[PDB]
Design a binder for this molecule. Structure first.
Ligand SMILES: CC(=O)NCCOCCOCCOCCOCCOCCOCCC(=O)N1CCN(c2ccc3c(NCCN)nc(C4(c5ccc(Cl)cc5)CCCC4)nc3c2)CC1
Ligand SMILES: CC(=O)NCCOCCOCCOCCOCCOCCOCCC(=O)N1CCN(c2ccc3c(NCCN)nc(C4(c5ccc(Cl)cc5)CCCC4)nc3c2)CC1
Ligand SMILES: [Mg+2]
Length: 300
């Protein structure tokens, strides 16, 4: 992790970057801010190229579509709480998700959004914005405090609150046992395994494949090739995460690196070519009057 670049938010006494994702254009990163702005930056010079006010509360998450035409946002304390934006020709709101605290695109075909409202998953059609499906079984709920619903690589399964759902049937296939309070789980890009906190489960047998102790309380991000996973541990203005991230081989789950950047982390992502890791790092403590984040770009 050779540091390659660093930059602070332009035009701000205290820099308020909260989240990041690479754009569909190389060298240009999308960042959300604590004032609910979306920004495009040159990831080398630190030049702000464009700004839009998406929300009147801080951005907690963004996701650009692969085709460059759409963007999902989530905020901390707004109504609507999450939204879908167009970025073709003009920046405009397409749909909103009134109380969803987190949103993701579908994966194989980006024609749907999945939102999370507490323990509940909501699946929306991108074109109409209609809510197609509510996935929630109160008898199977784990009530994970950081529940984030997610599609699998083929968009035909969902993981919500530790429950595996088949999308076509709207049926719960399996409830994974609850072994932590916070982390609800992600699909491996390989489509065969889920990763729920320290447990790696096989989807074709529901056997336990691996225990990975260093994944405890981590929010997991894969690189685009699906060969490496980056975990950033929840903090035990509060930052969501602590000051370290860990990298693992996505094939055998062996640790690769543990990096303590000595600043609390708000987000991290990779570019589509997997050259880089961008991290949002707070120079200020959780006691500071104002956050003062940087984006640091590392060559992987
Ligand atoms: N290269 C990569 C592209 N990049 C620039 C330069 C200008 C842009 C612009 N208008 C002037 C901004 N001050 N609007 C845009 C829009 C936008 C607006 C706000 C945000 Cl936040 C994100 C995107 C609306 C049309 C689609 C995106 N994207 C832009 C990209 C220049 C260097
Ligand atoms: O609650 C409502 C009270 O809020 C009103 C007071 O506001 C002061 C509060 C305020 O402004 N903050 C500035 C912004 N900050 C941030 C900044 C980044 C976040 C993040 N990044 C990674 C994904 N992109 N993920 C997340 C979430 C997450 C967290 C842990 C895990 Cl494991 C999985 C998902 C939770 C919501 C969306 C994914 N949460 C985040 C919060 C909150 C404090
Ligand atoms: Mg705002």
């Amino acid at each position: 992790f050779r540091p390659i670049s660093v930059f602070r938010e332009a035009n701000e006494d205290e820099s308020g970057f909260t989240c990041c994702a690479f754009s569909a254009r190389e060298r240009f990163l999308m960042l959300g801010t604590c004032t609910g702005q979306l920004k495009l930056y040159n990831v080398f010079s630190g030049q702000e190229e464009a700004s839009y006010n998406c929300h009147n509360s801080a951005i907690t998450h963004l996701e650009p579509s692969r085709d460059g035409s759409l963007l999902l946002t989530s905020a901390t304390w707004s109504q609507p709480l999450s939204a879908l934006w167009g970025m073709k020709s003009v920046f405009d709101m397409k749909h909103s998700f009134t109380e969803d605290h987190y949103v993701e695109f579908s994966k194989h075909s980006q024609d749907r959004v999945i939102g999370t409202k507490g323990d509940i998953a909501h699946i929306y059609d991108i074109q109409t914005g209609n809510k197609l499906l509510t996935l929630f079984n109160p008898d199977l709920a784990n009530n994970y405090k950081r529940n984030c619903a997610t599609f699998n690589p083929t968009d035909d399964l969902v993981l919500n609150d530790g429950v595996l759902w088949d999308v076509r049937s709207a049926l719960a296939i399996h409830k994974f046992d609850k072994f932590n309070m916070n982390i609800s789980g992600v699909f491996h890009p390989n489509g065969l395994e889920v990763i729920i906190n320290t447990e790696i489960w096989d989807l074709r047998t529901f056997h336990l494949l691996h225990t990975v102790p260093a994944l405890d309380q981590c929010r997991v991000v894969f690189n685009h090739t699906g060969t490496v996973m980056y975990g950033a541990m929840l903090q035990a203005m509060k930052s969501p995460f602590g000051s370290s991230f860990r990298t693992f081989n996505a094939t055998d789950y062996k640790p690769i690196a543990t990096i303590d950047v000595k600043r609390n982390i708000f987000d991290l992502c990779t570019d589509t070519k997997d050259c880089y890791l961008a991290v949002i790092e707070n120079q200020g403590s959780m006691d500071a009057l104002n956050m003062d984040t940087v984006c640091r770009l590392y060559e992987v």
